[PDB]
Amino acid sequence: ATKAVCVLKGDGPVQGIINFEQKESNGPVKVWGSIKGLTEGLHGFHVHEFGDNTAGCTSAGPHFNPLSRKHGGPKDEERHVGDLGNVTADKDGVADVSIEDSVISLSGDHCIIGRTLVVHEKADDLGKGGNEESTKTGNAGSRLACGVIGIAQ
Amino acid sequence: ATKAVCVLKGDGPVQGIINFEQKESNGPVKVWGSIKGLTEGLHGFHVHEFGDNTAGCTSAGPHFNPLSRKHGGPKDEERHVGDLGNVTADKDGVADVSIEDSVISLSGDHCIIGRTLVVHEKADDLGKGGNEESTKTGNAGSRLACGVIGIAQ
Ligand SMILES: [Cu+2]
Ligand SMILES: [Cu+2]
Ligand SMILES: [Zn+2]
Ligand SMILES: [Zn+2]
C-alpha cells in the first residue's frame, strides 16, 4: 500500500478524516486531514495496537509498540512506533493535521494498516512528566474519537 | 496476524460483530459472529478492496480481486478472493455467521486486513444469474452495513 485512510468517530461529535501516503517503501509517511468538535489546544495523537472497536476506543488496547520501548515524542529515538505526539485545535475546535514520520510505515515490520488511530482528551507529555504513567501513555487521558486504518485507492 | 475483527454499521438498523482466526500461516481462516436488523433470508457477504468508509459503504469500492478473476461463490475455483457468498437471517432478523475459507488470508497477497467487510440488501447469485452483472457483483444490491477489518488481540 502507498495510500491509507481513517474515519475518526466519538462523542461531541468529535469527527475527522485522516489521510496517509508513502511514495517509497523505506520512505517517510505523510499524515494529513482535519478534526472538528475539539477543545482549543493540544490533543494526544497515537496509533494503538489493535484495530478493534467492539466496545469503542478502549478495545484498541495500548500504543503500537512492536520493539517494547518506552513512550516518547515523535522526534525521540526512545519511542513507540505509534507515538505521533500532539495535534492542535483552534478557537473553533478544528485541528488541521500535517505530519511527516520516518518510524511508522504502510508496509513491513512497522505497518499501521489494520490498527486504531486515536485522538485524546488532554495533551501528550511526551514522557517528560516525571510520573510512572508519563513513559507509558504520556498522561493524554480519555479517547475522544478513533477509527481503523484501512487501505486507500 | 493470527486474529482479526470487524464492527458492521450502516445508515439503517443493520449492525454486527465478525471475528477471524488463522491458526497456521497459509492455513484456513474461521469467520464467526452475529448480524441483527436484517430481512429474513440470504444476504451477500464480501470483502471489498478499500478500507475507506469516508462516505459510508460506497467508498469501499469493488470486490477484493488481486488475481483478476470473475465473481463466483466461495466453493468455486473461479471467484474473487473477497467472495464469501451469503449469510442467512431468521424471522427475528439475526444471522449467526460460521464460515471456513482457504482463499482469504490474514497475511500476504490474499491479506484482508485493512479492507472492508460488507453485508448486502439482496442475495448473491454466485455468478449464476445469466446477466453481465452476475459475474461482477452477483446482483446483491445496496450495502446495508460495513466496517474495516482490524488486527485483534
Ligand atoms: Cu493514544
Ligand atoms: Cu459486496
Ligand atoms: Zn506511546
Ligand atoms: Zn466478487
Author numbering:
A (entry chain B), B (entry chain A): 1 to 153
Article, verbatim:
Mutations in the gene encoding Cu-Zn superoxide dismutase 1 (SOD1) cause a subset of familial amyotrophic lateral sclerosis (fALS) cases. A common property of ALS-associated SOD1 mutations is that they increase the propensity of the dissociation of the SOD1 dimer, which promotes misfolding and aggregation of the resulting monomers into cytotoxic species. We postulate that 2 free cysteines situated on adjacent monomers, Cys111a and Cys111b (separate by approximately 9 Å), could be cross-linked to prevent dimer dissociation.
Resolution of the as-isolated structure is a little less as a smaller crystal was used for this purpose. Waters are indicated as small red spheres, Cu and Zn molecules are represented by cyan and orange spheres, respectively. These water molecules are largely excluded upon the incorporation of S-XL6.
